[PDB]
RNA sequence: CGCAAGACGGACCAGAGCGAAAGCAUUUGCCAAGAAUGUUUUCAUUAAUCAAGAACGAAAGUCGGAGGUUCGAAGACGAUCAGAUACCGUCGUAGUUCCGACCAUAAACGAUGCCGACUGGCGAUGCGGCGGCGUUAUUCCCAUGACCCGCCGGGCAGCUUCCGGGAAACCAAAGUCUUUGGGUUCCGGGGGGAGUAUGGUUGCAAAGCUGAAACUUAAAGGAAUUGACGGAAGGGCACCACC
């Protein structure tokens, strides 16, 4: 392409979030307006947006990022749905430090809806307030007992819920707080998070369920 | 590395001497 | 030109990708999904000798050239993503990194959040240069 | 494209720089906004309270 | 430039002040006349340098001690911090508390009967 | 004659220890011979912070840190002045420099 | 140790501190005790470093559990040592 | 934005752990093995060190199958230079990965055989056991986990001292030696010629093991001291140095 001012041929569209988030407008995006065998909506669909939770929800922390996908276009609006979540680079780099044990786990699970998800969890040992020793290491069997409890709690919450109730748990991250309560009888833990979620497979398109998440 | 190279020089001379003598009879 | 038809009291955001290494620096601004390019300018477009392409000055001149084209197309604020080369290599940003960021601020763009984006392996293929390293 | 001339006042001298000690290193305060101060390198003899003429304000330099 | 004073100047000035403190003062032109009659100095230019450092030392001695110099006026008030102070008319009195393991140590030594008591913390402070 | 009691390495009670490749020259050396440096800095310099805080869209934001861990061989650590040579009795001091 | 401490008369606090094989004459740290439980009350004898899961004459499911050191009693009414 | 293939397990990671040594770091399961500790269990001298003989043994290399992402001997080119068959750059064969046979070497190092006894002090650290006032978690106590204060085995190490030793550097062993003897295996005899010639033996090959003499020579070597010197580092100086 060597077009004279191709920005003369572009239409701006709006981008709209799912109805859970307290702030529902994402921003604006470009596409080339329709021509023979190349429609505008086919260029707008399947695009990914990555947004800080503090721009979706009013009172929240900035260090969780959510991924959203476009599914259909209505008038000048692009309508979006959930695709995953992650932690910012500078958060994870600040937690990993010397003289501690780091514990990690992962699971594959389905909702009551047809979605197949994969989840990752992390936790770190706690220095006790009287401790005069320099290091806070767990023994190998204590680490194995904690990892089974991470997987046990993390599978329980997804199997009996839909994607609506799953995202409502991830916004405050009640999953990581329940693991942090349960493990204190084995070894005290000080940072605990569901640090990443990936989607592996999903059901048919279902316009009625899409609009139930938007009305 | 002069000693390692003097060792290599002797090995190639011995390989020549091997092939030269064992041809004779 | 044509940005969004709203033009008072609120911002229109883009994403700026800054890739700063030794040898060169890129300034590249995109749509909020990353799929459509708005403009791209580099250190080697501004200077006329290869030594200077990674310099603080060339990076300042590239950032001023990008910020004028943003306002001309109706964008008012930027999110920033910063890269060093990554992989097997050094993963510290090159010398032109600091100059591009202040130059798009001083030329009137509003600043959103900023992120480090360099690619890191959990473990990697064998690095170039042999067992004895590059020797000088 | 073009940018205007700026005038700035010397507030402190910091030391001498270059291969033969040729350039003084100095802190200057802009005369259109008393809050804005930067560091520069100067070729001649310099004294506290001198005024410099800057052909670009946006460039700043450390130890050459 | 360099205005540092050599040991010939600094030693002669100290020995003058040890012997003639009662003659000296802050006026350089009077010190310059005193130093000419209490000592034999070979040069006018050396006499001026000695009276100069003597004038500097008098202005220091008016504030506190100088470690290389001594005078009766400063020694007799040191001798008044020596001997006994005006601070108190009696000792700090022997009515002081005792810990349970010191009470037990005194019990085995056939003593006690004049001290109050209390216990420390439940576990060693961290 | 022997120069150091530890042979210039941390290895005691072990046979083999894995190598690493240096951040300057990609030479190959043991993980416990390599000289360590962990650097934590702001993304924005102490001169530039004021110019970037005033153009910010937010009423409150805190600029992020950059984290990098570096590894050197003896030749790079000496040439880049990370370490200096020391007096025969001063070589015994294991405490890091003052702040 | 000073230059002149006599070796024939260690105090009982010097002797109780050291290892069983390194005392002046050898002696074990283990002991025999008599043990009693609720529901059936026939008293029985146990060794403090037992390896067996002991069952009482009262036929209860466990009197004590074995362990890497001393065995642990199931909250029984006695841990009393026999004197000799 | 999405797909495919082969290699690798960062940060946490330490004078920390395990193994006869070579060596050993994503998750979960299965198979056989092991040190230390606890013990008022059992046999009752069954032990220590070893010609002959035997198992394991980094990387590179050889033979027969499969795979081939990254890196890269030989090789083709661009630079640098008096030349540059090199150091620096672009490309790339064998190899680098897996399976089945060979090979037996290394600064294979603590440059320091194994077993047993005795001779100073101090603070930490990993494992098992013993005792104790509090704080914290689960259920409401009890028991048990994370922390805190001591003691005992045996482990990788550290600091200190006129134990004592040594040519010294240094060493709690490299000590208990002319005041010379606890047991036992291998092995050195001034520097070169030389790990060479010749015979034997093992191997597909490369090569491994065993191994001389004629002749030649006044020193070769170890630890430490004072200078001089460095394309080593840190302070300071000079118009016979520079701006």
From TrEMBL, chain A:
GO MF term (any one): structural constituent of ribosome
Keyword Aminoacyl-tRNA synthetase in annotation: no
Subcellular location: Cytoplasm; Nucleus; Nucleus, Nucleolus
An example Gene Ontology biological process: translation
Keywords linked to the UniProt accession: Cytoplasm, Differentiation, Nucleus, Ribonucleoprotein, Ribosomal protein
Main location: cytoplasm
Gene Ontology CC annotation, any one: cytosolic small ribosomal subunit
Task of the protein: May play a role during erythropoiesis through regulation of transcription factor DDIT3.
Assembly: Component of the small ribosomal subunit. Mature ribosomes consist of a small (40S) and a large (60S) subunit. The 40S subunit contains about 33 different proteins and 1 molecule of RNA (18S). The 60S subunit contains about 49 different proteins and 3 molecules of RNA (28S, 5.8S and 5S). Identified in a IGF2BP1-dependent mRNP granule complex containing untranslated mRNAs. Binds with high affinity to IPO4. Interacts with DDIT3. Part of the small subunit (SSU) processome, composed of more than 70 proteins and the RNA chaperone small nucleolar RNA (snoRNA) U3.
Family (UniProt): Belongs to the eukaryotic ribosomal protein eS1 family.
Protein name: Small ribosomal subunit protein eS1
Range of the intact protein held here: 19 to 233 of 264
């Amino acid at each position: 392409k060597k077009v004279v001012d191709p920005f003369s041929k572009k239409d701006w569209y709006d981008v709209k979030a799912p109805a859970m988030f307290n702030i529902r407008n994402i921003g604006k995006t470009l596409v080339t307006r329709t021509q023979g065998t190349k429609i505008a909506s086919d260029g707008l669909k399947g695009r990914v947006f990555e947004v800080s939770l503090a721009d979706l929800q009013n009172d929240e922390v900035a260090f969780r990022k959510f991924k959203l996908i476009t599914e259909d276009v209505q008038g000048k609006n692009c309508l979006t749905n959930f695709h995953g979540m992650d932690l910012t680079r500078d958060k994870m780099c600040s937690m990993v430090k010397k003289w501690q044990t780091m514990i990690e786990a992962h699971v594959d699970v389905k909702t009551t809806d047809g979605y197949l998800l994969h989840l990752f969890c992390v936790g770190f040992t706690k220095k006790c307030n009287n401790q005069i020793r320099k290091t806070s290491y767990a023994q190998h069997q204590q680490v194995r007992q904690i990892r089974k409890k991470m997987m046990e709690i993390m599978t329980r919450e997804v199997q009996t819920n839909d994607l609506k109730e799953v995202v409502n748990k991830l916004i405050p991250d009640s999953i990581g707080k329940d693991i942090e309560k349960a493990c204190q009888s084995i070894y005290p833990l000080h940072d605990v998070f569901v640090r990443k979620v990936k989607m592996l497979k999903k059901p048919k398109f279902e316009l009625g369920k899409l609009m139930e998440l938007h009305g | 590395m002069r000693a390692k190279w003097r060792k290599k020089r002797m090995r190639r001379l011995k390989r020549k001497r091997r092939k030269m003598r064992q041809r004779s009879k | 030109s044509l940005g969004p038809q709203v033009a008072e009291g609120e911002n229109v955001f883009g994403v700026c990708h800054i890739f700063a290494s030794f040898n060169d620096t890129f300034v590249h601004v995109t749509d909020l999904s990353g799929k459509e390019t708005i403009c791209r300018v580099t250190g080697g477009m501004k200077v006329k000798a290869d030594r200077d392409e990674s310099s603080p000055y060339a990076a300042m001149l590239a950032a001023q050239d990008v910020a004028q084209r943003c306002k001309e197309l109706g964008i008012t604020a930027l999110h920033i993503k910063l890269r060093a080369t990554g992989g097997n290599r050094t993963k510290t940003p090159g010398p032109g990194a600091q100059s591009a960021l202040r130059a798009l601020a001083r030329s009137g763009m509003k600043i959103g959040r900023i992120e480090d984006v360099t690619p890191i392996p959990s473990d990697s293929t064998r690095r170039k240069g042999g067992r004895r390293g590059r020797r000088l | 494209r073009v940018q205007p001339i700026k005038l700035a006042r010397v507030t402190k001298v910091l030391g001498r720089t270059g291969s033969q000690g040729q350039c003084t290193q100095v802190r200057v305060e802009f005369m259109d906004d008393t809050s804005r101060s930067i560091i520069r390198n100067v070729k001649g003899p310099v004294r506290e309270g001198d005024v410099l003429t800057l052909l670009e304000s946006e460039r700043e330099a450390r130890r050459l | 430039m360099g205005r540092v004073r050599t040991k010939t100047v600094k030693k002669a000035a100290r020995v003058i002040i040890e012997k003639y403190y009662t003659r000296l003062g802050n006026d350089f032109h009077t010190n310059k006349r005193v130093c000419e009659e209490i000592a034999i100095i070979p040069s006018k230019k050396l006499r001026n340098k000695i009276a100069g450092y003597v004038t500097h030392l008098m202005k220091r001695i008016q504030r506190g001690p100088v470690r290389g110099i001594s005078i009766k006026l400063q020694e007799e008030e040191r001798e008044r911090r020596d001997n006994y102070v005006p601070e108190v008319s009696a000792l700090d009195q022997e009515i002081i508390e005792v810990d349970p393991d010191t009470k037990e140590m005194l019990k085995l030594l056939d003593f006690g009967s004049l001290s109050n008591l209390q216990v420390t913390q439940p576990t060693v402070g961290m | 004659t022997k120069k150091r009691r530890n042979n210039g390495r941390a290895k005691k009670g072990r046979g083999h220890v894995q190598p690493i490749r240096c951040t300057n020259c990609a030479c190959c050396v043991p993980k416990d011979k390599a000289i360590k440096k962990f650097v934590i800095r702001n993304i924005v310099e102490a001169a530039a912070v004021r110019d970037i805080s005033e153009v910010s869209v937010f009423d409150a934001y805190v600029l992020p840190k950059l984290y990098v861990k570096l590894h050197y061989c003896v030749s790079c650590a000496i040439h880049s002045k990370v370490v200096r040579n020391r007096s025969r009795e001063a070589r015994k001091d294991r405490t890091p420099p003052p702040r | 140790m000073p230059l002149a401490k006599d070796l024939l008369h260690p105090s009982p606090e010097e002797e109780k501190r050291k290892h069983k094989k390194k005392r002046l004459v050898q002696s074990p740290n283990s002991y025999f005790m008599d043990v009693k439980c609720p529901g059936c009350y026939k008293i029985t004898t146990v060794f403090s470093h037992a390896q067996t899961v002991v069952l009482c004459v009262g036929c209860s499911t466990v009197l004590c559990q074995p362990t890497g050191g001393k065995a642990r009693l199931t909250e029984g009414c006695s841990f009393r040592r026999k004197q000799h």
